[PDB]
A paper describes a structure:
BK channels comprise four identical α subunits (Slo1)2,3 with seven transmembrane segments (TMD) and a large C-terminal cytosolic domain (CTD). A voltage sensing domain (VSD, segments S0–S4) and a pore-gate domain (segments S5–S6) reside in the membrane. Additionally, two homologous regulators of the conductance of K+ domains (RCK) in each subunit (RCK1 and RCK2) assemble as a tetrameric gating ring (4× CTD) and serve as the cytoplasmic Ca2+ sensor.
The remaining charged residues in S4 (R1 and R2) maintain similar positions in the R3Q-apo and R3Q Ca2+-bound structures. R1 forms a salt bridge with D120 (S1) with a bond length of 2.7 Å, while R2 couples with D175 (S3) and exhibits weak interactions with F149 (S2). This indicates that the conformational changes in the gating ring must affect the structure of the TMD. In the R3Q-apo, the αB helix is partially unfolded at its ends (residues: L374-K381), unlike in the R3Q Ca2+-bound state where the αB helix (residues: L372-R382) is reminiscent of all our open structures. In the Ca2+-bound R3Q structure, a network of interactions between RCK1 and VSD is established. This network connects the αB helix to S5 and S4, with non-covalent interactions involving residues L374-R223, R382-T211, and R382-N214. Additionally, hydrogen bonds connect the αB helix to S4 (K381-D208; 3.2 Å) and the C-linker to S0’ (K331-D86; 3.2 Å). Thus, the open state observed in the R3Q Ca2+-bound condition may be achieved through the interaction between L374 and R223, which underlies the coupling between S5 and S6 observed in all BK open structures.
Residue numbers in the entry:
A (entry chain C): 14 to 44, 79 to 124, 134 to 426
B (entry chain D): 214 to 561, 567 to 621
The structure:
């Protein structure tokens, strides 16, 4: 029954501000403190002031609290605790919306920025909810998109130090925020039912069934234990298929690539209480190591407990990794180079018995090798 | 003539080919399933809508295959088999090529919107996370006096993620644009008609320094062809290439056009250590912004050295209290009272005099050159009171209330 009142509250608040901006632009086309305010608000939202650094943290955390209130409203079922706290958070988001409005260079491109729509589709409906005594579930899920600010927060802080960690956190949080958002959108359409059929054609899916069904479809598994049946939910599933198969099929391999590109022979040589060790470096390969070890560890030598510690800037090939495992009790291998003082400390070379520097006897040029 | 470029041609071909084949195949399945099969006297049939067929073809060509809808006539099933063999290839090749074309778009296009009374500096040439971070931490350093200068990077490339993070940390005072100083349209975008200066950074670690110098000389030629009177500061790797830009028709050191020749400077700092051992270190530390900051792990010789590294070169107007002192008296005053080391003065055309003898007086409004920990420390020499208002010499108390 009442849904159009909540929807109208977002459309009139969007449209009226857009009209005011167009009128103001045409008036000043035909016919200082504000720059200090712009740059102050800019330093706030950029996290350059301490008050900014906070405000940004509070906007993030309260957006998560608002999202969790939406999950509770979606897993359940104006005098209620949930409508009260989510209204309080909406008032806080409205203050932050004005701070971005001040900070922005162009008011028109600001009034069409993505988070301005998240605000239009949430603050006005949250006022209407208490006014009409009706906790409408509505577009509130869109707050999940505020998760997508995490790479900016972790960049306004110096914590996200490397290009691969930046790319990793961007991929994961982009995926999760879009998946949570699209699940809320399908949940709205299927539980609404279609307007062309007077909302009679509808399904009572939970949010969690929609979240599962979107994972099952974007992976292209498509069990069909759950499926959309409204014409809006089916046209949404068609649009979702054209977009999110591309996302899943590109994101999951790039996550697997970043998680695969990790040093497996990092860490440090733990010097045993009374044993000697020899560091070995330079040309380290299955051919050099096998010929070295079969002479060094040969049974015709007297029995002496010397550990061999290979140090090399590379991953072992599978043949060498097998050979290292056959000598596990007396041979150890570390990623690194004798050119770094940190790697020399790892191999514990202060208290090695000797260091052996092996040469590539079959290099293209012996002076570069020497 | 509207579809102007090869990628827009390919884009519109892919989209409309896909949509027309998908709409056509949906009509074909709708005919077969609602017809029913002729072998069974049309008794085996389904009353699908066209829209259910259009949906079912999308659900099958994407390989999702819910099976909420499926074909049941032998003709509709053999059509679905033929459709699967053809359209899986189309979907799996078209959707990535659409995503590629939509991805290959300039993200740092657009134009510098010149704020009403702020200055800006254009920066170009070798722009990378390594060059930009080292540049910005000296340019925006807190030991300099507070001035609102915007930095506008112009470069023919997309920022790496490290540089894009650095640009976002300086969002209030640093902006970046895709483009080259070789294009008059890009020079207009960066608004270089009303920039304060243009800085042309060099790749000091290029495979060949003459190709790098030739590129940077062409950039100055381009910048000054667009507007002669912009101050250009350029980094050069070789001294003999400096002759080429001295011969540009519109290059003028009297406007402050300036070629920072890395080889000229490097070897002259080294020559100075041949005359006064270690002076290369004294003088090189003096020309980058650093602030002292002890640590408990630091040995006492390192604390002395590091306290010295915290000082750099500054310029200020000497206060009226210095007028008609000899230079030695002004230097004694600055040191013994103000804790400031006065090296030199710009004598009124004008000429720079370093440690001049008793024969020169300080004029009115003389620029002096100082060594100090920060610009805000040197401002004591400008605020320095009449002797009546600065007898106490607890130097933090020197301030603009001199009268
Ligand atoms: Ca300093
Ligand atoms: K599949
Ligand atoms: K499937
Ligand atoms: K399936
Ligand atoms: K199925
Ligand atoms: K099924
Ligand atoms: Mg061991
Ligand atoms: Mg600006």
């Amino acid at each position: 029954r009442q849904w159009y009142s909540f929807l109208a509250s977002s459309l009139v608040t969007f449209g009226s501000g857009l009209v005011v901006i167009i009128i103001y632009r045409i008036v000043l086309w035909l016919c200082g403190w504000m720059t200090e305010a712009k740059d102050w608000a800019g330093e706030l939202i950029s996290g350059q002031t301490t008050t900014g650094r906070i405000l940004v943290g509070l906007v993030f955390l309260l957006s998560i609290a608002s999202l969790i209130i939406y999950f509770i409203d979606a897993s359940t079922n104006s005098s209620s605790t949930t409508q009260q706290v989510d209204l309080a958070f909406n008032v806080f988001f409205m203050i932050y919306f004005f701070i971005r409005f001040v900070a922005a260079n162009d008011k028109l491109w600001f009034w069409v920025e993505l988070f301005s729509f998240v605000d239009y589709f949430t603050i006005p409906p949250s006022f209407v909810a208490i006014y009409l005594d009706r906790n409408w579930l509505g577009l509130r899920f869109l707050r999940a998109l505020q998760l997508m600010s995490i790479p900016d927060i972790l960049t306004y802080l110096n914590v996200l130090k490397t290009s691969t960690l930046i790319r990793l956190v961007q991929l994961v949080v982009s995926f999760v925020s879009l998946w949570l958002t699209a699940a809320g959108f399908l949940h709205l359409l299927e539980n609404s039912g279609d307007p062309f059929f007077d909302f009679g054609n509808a399904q009572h899916l939970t949010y969690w069934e929609c979240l599962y069904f979107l994972m099952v479809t974007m992976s292209t598994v498509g069990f069909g234990d759950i499926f959309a049946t409204t014409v809006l939910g089916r046209t949404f599933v068609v649009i979702f298929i054209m977009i999110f198969i591309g996302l899943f099929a590109s994101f999951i391999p790039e996550i697997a690539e970043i998680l695969g590109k990790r040093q497996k022979y990092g860490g440090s040589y733990k010097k045993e209480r009374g044993k000697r060790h020899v560091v070995v470096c330079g040309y380290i390969t299955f051919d050099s190591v096998s010929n070295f070890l079969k002479d060094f560890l040969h049974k015709d030598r007297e029995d002496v407990d010397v550990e061999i510690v290979f140090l090399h800037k590379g991953l072992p090939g599978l043949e060498l990794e097998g050979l290292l495992k056959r000598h596990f009790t007396q041979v150890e291998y570390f990623w690194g180079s004798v050119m770094d003082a940190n790697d020399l400390e790892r191999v514990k070379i202060q208290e090695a018995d000797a260091c052996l520097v092996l040469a590539n006897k079959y290099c293209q040029d012996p002076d570069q090798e020497d | 003539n509207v579809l102007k470029t090869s990628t827009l041609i390919r884009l519109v071909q892919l989209v409309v080919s896909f949509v027309s084949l998908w709409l056509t195949a949906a009509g074909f399945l709708h005919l077969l399933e609602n017809s029913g099969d002729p072998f069974f006297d049309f008794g085996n049939a389904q009353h699908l809508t066209y829209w259910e067929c259009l949906y079912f073809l999308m659900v099958t060509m994407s390989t999702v295959g819910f099976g909420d809808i499926f074909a049941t006539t032998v003709l509709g099933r053999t059509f679905v088999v033929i459709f699967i063999m053809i359209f899986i290839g189309l979907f799996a090749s078209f959707i990535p090529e659409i995503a590629e074309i939509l991805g290959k778009r300039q993200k740092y296009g657009g134009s510098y919107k010149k704020e009403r009374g702020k200055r800006h500096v254009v920066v170009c040439g070798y722009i990378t996370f390594d060059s930009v971070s080292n540049f910005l931490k000296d340019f925006l350093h807190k030991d300099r006096e507070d001035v609102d200068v915007e930095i506008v990077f112009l470069h023919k490339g997309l920022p790496g993620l490290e540089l894009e993070g650095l640009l976002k940390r300086h969002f209030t005072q640093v902006e970046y644009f895709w483009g080259s100083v070789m294009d008059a349209n890009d020079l207009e975008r960066v608004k270089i008609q009303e920039a304060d200066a243009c800085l042309v950074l060099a790749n000091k670690y290029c495979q060949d320094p003459d190709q790098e110098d030739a590129a940077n000389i062409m950039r100055v030629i381009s910048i000054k062809n667009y507007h002669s009177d912009i101050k250009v500061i350029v980094q050069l790797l070789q001294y003999h290439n400096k002759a080429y830009l001295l011969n540009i028709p519109s290059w003028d050191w009297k406007r402050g056009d300036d070629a920072v020749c890395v080889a000229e400077l490097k070897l002259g700092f080294i020559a100075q250590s041949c005359l006064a051992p270690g002076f290369s270190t004294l003088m090189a530390n003096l020309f980058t912004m650093r602030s002292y900051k002890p640590t408990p792990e630091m040995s006492q010789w390192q604390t002395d050295y590091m306290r010295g590294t915290g000082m750099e070169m500054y310029t200020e107007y000497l206060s009226s209290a210095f007028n008609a002192l000899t230079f030695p008296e002004a230097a004694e005053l600055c040191f013994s009272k103000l804790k400031l080391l006065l090296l030199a003065i710009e004598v009124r055309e004008s000429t720079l005099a370093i440690n001049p003898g008793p024969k020169v007086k300080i004029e009115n409004a003389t620029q002096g050159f100082f060594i100090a920990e920060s610009a805000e420390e040197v401002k004591r020499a400008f605020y320095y009171c009449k002797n009546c208002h600065a007898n106490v010499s607890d130097v933090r108390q020197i301030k603009k209330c001199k009268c």
